[model samples]
Structures are given as structure tokens and as C-alpha cells.
Target: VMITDKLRRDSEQIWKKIFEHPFVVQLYSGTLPLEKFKFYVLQDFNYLVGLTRALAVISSKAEYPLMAELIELARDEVTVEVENYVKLLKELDLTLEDAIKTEPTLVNSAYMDFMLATAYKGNIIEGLTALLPCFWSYAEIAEYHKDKLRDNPIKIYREWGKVYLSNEYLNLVGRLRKIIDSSGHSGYDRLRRIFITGSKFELAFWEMAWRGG
Candidate 1:
């Protein structure tokens, strides 16, 4: 099996929990509490900034062509997705300033710290492994909710789900997955470790949101 496929299979337990997470379920059903969603947005705004930093760090260590592509992708997260988050906060009657002022929870802090450390200190493959779950998990969640996501009374949740499922986002994921699969067997064990760590963190993030963090 390809490395990406193996990573998912090996962590099927966590994947199941994330895919079936209460936060995600409620999100699709548009039944999640506004307060919980607000908490998630606040934490995620900070987390995305961390992710952009990690991506830039990773790009700096990459080969020239790949580095260029990664840098462009990172900018999209910083500008495009960051703006989307800001818009969500506005709709929540919260200001971008509020999200900016809020601190990340331990879970968010740990997840972003791991990504940054891996991107800065590990091989490109390892850094990619550590980051893939952020894209892949969201794509999977969006696909699982595709039909159900329509007609969600909460427009933001529905729009967020569609953003993940969009061709643009999935194409980015596909490109990243191809790069991961192309990386050969050297340090495969370390790759698995980072991938699983990120995967588990994805599940933890949802649980944190569910708990109003």
C-alpha cells in the first residue's frame, strides 16, 4: 500500500472517531451550539496562523519548485482562509479582534507546536506527514457530509463544509498526497509516527470543540 493509505489504515480507530465526531455530526445537522462554534472559530483562527507559519518554514526547506508551490499554498491559507474565518467571526457577532485576543487552548497549542517543530526540524516527507491530516481529514469530513450539508440552517457551517469539498481544496490535497506517496521508504517509521500524531490531534481538536474549548 502507499504510505498515505497505510497511515490512514493504521490509524483507522482515530479516523473513525474524527469522522464520527459529535462536533462534526452536529455541524452537518446545524445543531451545534453557537457558543461551541464560536469557541472553535476563535481557536482555529490562531491555529491557522500557526499552520501558515509551519508551511512557510517547511517551504523554506523544500526544493525550489516544490518550495514555490508550497509558499503559494501557504499564502492562500493566510489570506483566503483567514479572511473566511474573520467573516465567520463577524457573523457570530464577534470581532476579528476578539479572535486575535483569545489564546489557544492546550490542544490547539500542542497541535500547532508539533507541526512547527516537524516542519523546522524534520525531513520534507516527515513535515508533510505531520501536516497532511489537516487537509485530508477535512476533505474526508466534507465528503461524508456532502449531501447532508445542504440546507443547514447555520449558513456558516454549510459554507465551511462546502469549502473543504470544493475542487480547489481537494486538488491541493491530491497534490500533497501524491508528493507523500512519491517519497520512498527512507525513514518510513518516523513518517508513520508524525502522521499518526497529526491524525490523533485532528480527533482531539474536534473533541475540544465539542467540549466548548
Candidate 2:
């Protein structure tokens, strides 16, 4: 069985919570408060900065194609996606310092620590497993909510949601799973542990946003 498939089943309940989180539901339905999203965007910038570092660490352990992909992902975290974040901040009348100097909440800190530790200490498969939720879950959430997202009255959010729905974004999710399955031959139990932990963090990240971090 595909490790990704089993991981998904193991984390389904947490994933359900993530999908049902008020932050997600409200954003798609045009009801989420802008302050909450603005808060999330800043926290998201902090999270992705850590993510880029983790990806760079993992890049050192990967083979040519995979390593190149990891580097590209890290680079984009600081580049293209970054531009969107800066624009989002300006849209909110917030400065880049607002995103840069703001420390992560304890929950966000824990999540980043987990990701960095996994990336630095484990096999490439393990690294990918821990990071997969942030990538894969976003695609799944966007696909799940795409219909209602059309009616979303907020232009910035609507465009941001479109980011995940693109073919390129979904293909990136596919490549991560493909690499994870091909990498470590580690059985379900170990992969399940890390994947589920990442899933929990995913839910908690949304909760932090809902709680207005």
C-alpha cells in the first residue's frame, strides 16, 4: 500500500478538524474576519521562513532530482510565495517587520521545532513525511472548498485560495508523495507516527489562527 494513503487514513480525524476549522470555513465562505486572516498571514510568513531552512537541510541528504526540488522549494518559500506575503501585508497596512520580527506563538514554535528536528535528524522519507501535511492538506482543503470559494467576496483571499488549486501546486503535492514512497523503505508504523504528528500540528496551526495568534 502507498505510505501516503495509509498516512492519510491514520490522520483523517485530525484532517477533518482542519477542514472544519472556523478559520478555513470562514475564509472560503467569505465570513472570516480580516484581522484573523491578517494574523494568519504574518504567522504564515514566520512558518514558511522556518520551512525554508528545514527544506535546505533536507536538500543536503537527497539525490540529484529530489535535492534540486528541495532547493527549489526552499528558494520559492523565500521568493515567489514571499512576494504574495509581502503584498498581503501591504494590503493589510502592515509592514514587513510585522512579519519578520514577530516571534511565533508557542504552538507555532513547537511546530517549527518539530519540522526542523525531523528534517535535520531523519531519512529523506522521514523529512518529507513530516512536511507533507502543510503541502498536501492545503491542496485537499482547496479542492474541498473550491466551489464555495468562487463566491468568496474577498479578492485577496480568493486569489490566495487559487494558489493551491493550480495544477502546478497539486503536481508538487504529487511529487512529494512520489518521493516519499520511493525513498526510505521504512514500514507504516514509523511513517505513520511522524505523518500524524504533522497532521496534528496542521490542525493546531489553524486553531492558532482562529484564536487570533
Measured with C-alpha atoms, the lDDT of residue 40 in candidate 2 is 89
**How well is each residue in 1-213 modelled by candidate 1, as lDDT tens digits?**
899999888888888888789999988889988888888988988788988989998899999999999999889888988788888888899988898899888999999999999998898888888999999999998888777799689888887788888898899899999999998877778888898899999999999878876
Worst 10 residues of 1 by lDDT: 142-151
- Across 1-213, the per-residue lDDT of candidate 2 in tens digits comes to 778888999899999998988899999988989989888888887798889988998999989987998999999999997888888889889988889987788889899889999998888888888899989999999999999899999988898899899999999999998987775555668789999999999999999988976
User: What are the RMSD figures for all models against the true structure?
Assistant: 1.2, 1.2
- Candidate lDDT (C-alpha), each: 0.88, 0.88
Give candidate 1 regions above 4 Å deviation.
none
